[PDB]
Ligand binder design. Sequence first.
Ligand SMILES: CCN1CCN(c2ccc(C(=O)Nc3[nH]nc4cc(-c5cccc(OC)c5)ccc34)cc2)CC1
Length: 289
Amino acid sequence: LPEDPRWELPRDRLVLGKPLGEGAFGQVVLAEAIGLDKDKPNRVTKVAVKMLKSDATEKDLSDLISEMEMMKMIGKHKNIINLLGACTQDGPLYVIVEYASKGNLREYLQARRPPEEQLSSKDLVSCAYQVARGMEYLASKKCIHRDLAARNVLVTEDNVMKIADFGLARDIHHIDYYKKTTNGRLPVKWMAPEALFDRIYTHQSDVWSFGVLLWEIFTLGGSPYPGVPVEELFKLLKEGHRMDKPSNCTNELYMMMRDCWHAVPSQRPTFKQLVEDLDRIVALTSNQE
Ligand SMILES: CCN1CCN(c2ccc(C(=O)Nc3[nH]nc4cc(-c5cccc(OC)c5)ccc34)cc2)CC1
């Protein structure tokens, strides 16, 4: 691998630890990095580190490299998982990124269902706002996520939402529609119809996904279309079926979901608009329940 002084960290500055993400994101571990920022060489920073597996092919390597290079191009934002460094010389590839100590957004929501303090209505809307901001940023940098979902949003120690796994151009025609997530759910249930049927991925189809994620948030981690298999989902979408309004969700926010699921992609809102709408809604939403 060619060295890149912008990002290189000597690998003896890294203390490796336990796995993260239950394999969903490949081999990612928690680590401690000494002197990440060279201004404070004596501080340690908890970071996430992604690396190849033992039984890994040549393209597994090129993919990890592409992922890293992509993250370099995209630049930094508060509501995405940022690149922090790399170990590329004299050993196996390490990609060093921000650590989100509270796991993914689906888990985090579920753990705060009534029987871990319950979330206020304002908290929930604020969660939506942060995810829209990260996506607004990524879209502005010409990045299409293709798998936006609460499982790919990570939460920091300070309850900041970060979009994860935006760096890989995953093998588009090559996707297993029947393959389930780590949780046992079907990723097709987040996909816009034109992405699912015509394999056309855009910022507009990411917005569809965001509507489903919105529905995840206000159901506190609910599973979309529970019990519905792939073939039946296809039929549902061909018919123009839409998920019902969650309880404890305003008509305004349900209308937002429905707009994100506009049958005509050009008519869906942009992440720019969603951020603006969500920003106003936050300021009017009570945190007293
Ligand atoms: C109450 C019980 N809780 C306790 C906390 N716990 C968890 C669970 C999971 C995490 C976690 O995965 N954190 C992560 N932070 N940053 C992360 C980056 C990637 C990542 C992804 C793609 C590409 C990449 O590099 C190129 C990296 C992955 C995972 C990451 C933390 C706490 C759950 C249960």
